[PDB]
């Protein structure tokens, strides 16, 4: 009955249960046919289905318009990865040969590995809010393995761009945005603007950052002095 079982299974990996699987807000609680042979395959499938259900759960959660652009950058990267899966699903279909459950596992190993790592980051992130995401990004980036390290690098590139934007604001128009508790400039009759030295990163050196702080600060201050400042420059 393998072909029928395969169409049910194919649908199952997408996170939609079949008439012979009791997958709900939970795994396959039992298989409706009980052989050991099926059961052993079933253990590896159950883990697989669980993860699909989790990813969807997480995605939905972050799509509730909650924290950082740092966070956003991550949603975009995960969202990219689900494209690969889809590609795999047409590719399995495209085969045109009878594909076994045994076969299904072998062909899609690589996604089990990448996907599982991405959950590790996600669990730790549940705690973290703001600038802590940046420390976690730094450590992760240091870890080797070509693929793992490669994913980590991609996340770094989209973030560094968020920083460049904040910097750009600061250096040219004395403007700065700290949003959910990242960067390092804090406000505070009081009305001052100043550097949070513990939050200055040393990735881009602290010393380097300190000079930058003085320069942005100086620009805003000049504007307040007189509207007409050194322009075209």
């Amino acid at each position: 009955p393998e072909e029928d079982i395969l169409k049910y299974v194919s649908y199952t990996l997408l996170a939609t249960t079949s008439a012979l699987f009791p997958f709900d807000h939970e795994q396959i609680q039992i298989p409706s046919k009980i052989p050991n042979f099926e059961s052993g395959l079933l253990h590896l499938i159950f883990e697989a289905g669980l993860l699909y259900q989790s990813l969807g759960y997480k995605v939905e959660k972050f799509r509730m318009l909650n924290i950082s652009p740092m966070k956003k950058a991550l949603i975009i990267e995960i969202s990219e990865e689900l494209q690969n899966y889809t590609a795999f699903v047409n590719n399995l279909v495209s085969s045109g040969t009878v594909v076994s459950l045994k076969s299904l596992y072998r062909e899609i190993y690589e996604n089990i590995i990448r996907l599982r790592i991405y959950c590790r980051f996600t669990e730790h992130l549940e705690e973290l809010s703001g600038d802590t995401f940046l420390i976690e990004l730094n450590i992760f980036k240091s870890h080797g393995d070509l693929t793992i390290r490669k994913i980590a690098t991609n996340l770094f590139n989209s973030m560094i761009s968020l920083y460049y934007e904040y910097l750009m604001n600061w250096l040219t128009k004395g403007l700065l945005r700290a949003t959910y508790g990242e960067f390092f400039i804090a406000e505070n009759y009081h009305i001052p603007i100043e550097f949070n030295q513990e939050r200055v990163p040393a990735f881009i050196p602290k010393e380097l950052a300190y000079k930058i702080f003085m320069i942005g600060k100086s620009y805003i201050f000049l504007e307040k002095y007189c509207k007409e400042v050194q322009w075209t420059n």
């Binding site: 997408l14 939609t16 249960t17 079949s18 008439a19 652009p69 969202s79 889809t86």
Partner: protein
């Protein structure tokens, strides 16, 4: 059984109206559900895309018919024309390839691609707008710089996604 379901699926997906698919004036059109657990779940996600497409057209009439708000129209006509061109081309081509090969063929790969581009731009726009329309009834009960401002807030939430801000910026520009 299976064959029947896929032929039934193609027909559902175009989202034609009828007597079997009934109308509630405000949920909107709704039809009875009764499918395989597999198909039924997919059909729920799908239901969301379709609902927006229908809401959008509705929204569109309102904003441009013989409305006031010169600016308001100018945006609406441009957005309706762009969404129509992308959707129409893509969809048409897709239904024909699926029918042509064998009388039905699977949606899902086709849908994923089309879905990302479409979903993101349209949804975001209409959601803000729905809140603002509500707000206007509330102001009336108890503008220019505000439209620019609202657009500015929207870019600012958007920041860090290339695609979105580029589209939005282009509409901003014309306006």
């Amino acid at each position: 059984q299976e064959a029947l379901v896929v032929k039934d699926l193609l027909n559902v997906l175009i989202g034609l109206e009828g007597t079997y698919i009934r109308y509630f004036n405000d949920i909107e059109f709704k039809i009875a559900k009764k499918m395989d657990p597999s198909f039924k779940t997919f059909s729920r996600r799908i239901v969301r895309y379709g609902k927006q497409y229908m809401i959008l057209t509705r929204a569109y009439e309102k904003w441009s018919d013989t409305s006031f708000g010169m600016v308001l129209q100018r945006f609406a006509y441009e957005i309706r024309r762009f969404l129509e061109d992308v959707y129409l081309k893509t969809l048409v081509e897709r239904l024909e390839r699926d029918f042509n090969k064998v009388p039905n063929f699977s949606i899902r790969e086709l849908e994923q691609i089309i879905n990302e581009t479409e979903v993101n731009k349209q949804m975001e726009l209409l959601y803000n707008i729905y809140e603002e329309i509500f707000r206007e009834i509330e102001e009336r009960r108890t503008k220019g710089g505000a439209i620019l401002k609202i657009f500015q807030q929207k870019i600012l939430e958007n920041l860090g996604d290339r695609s979105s801000v580029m589209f939005l910026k282009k509409l901003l520009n014309n306006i």
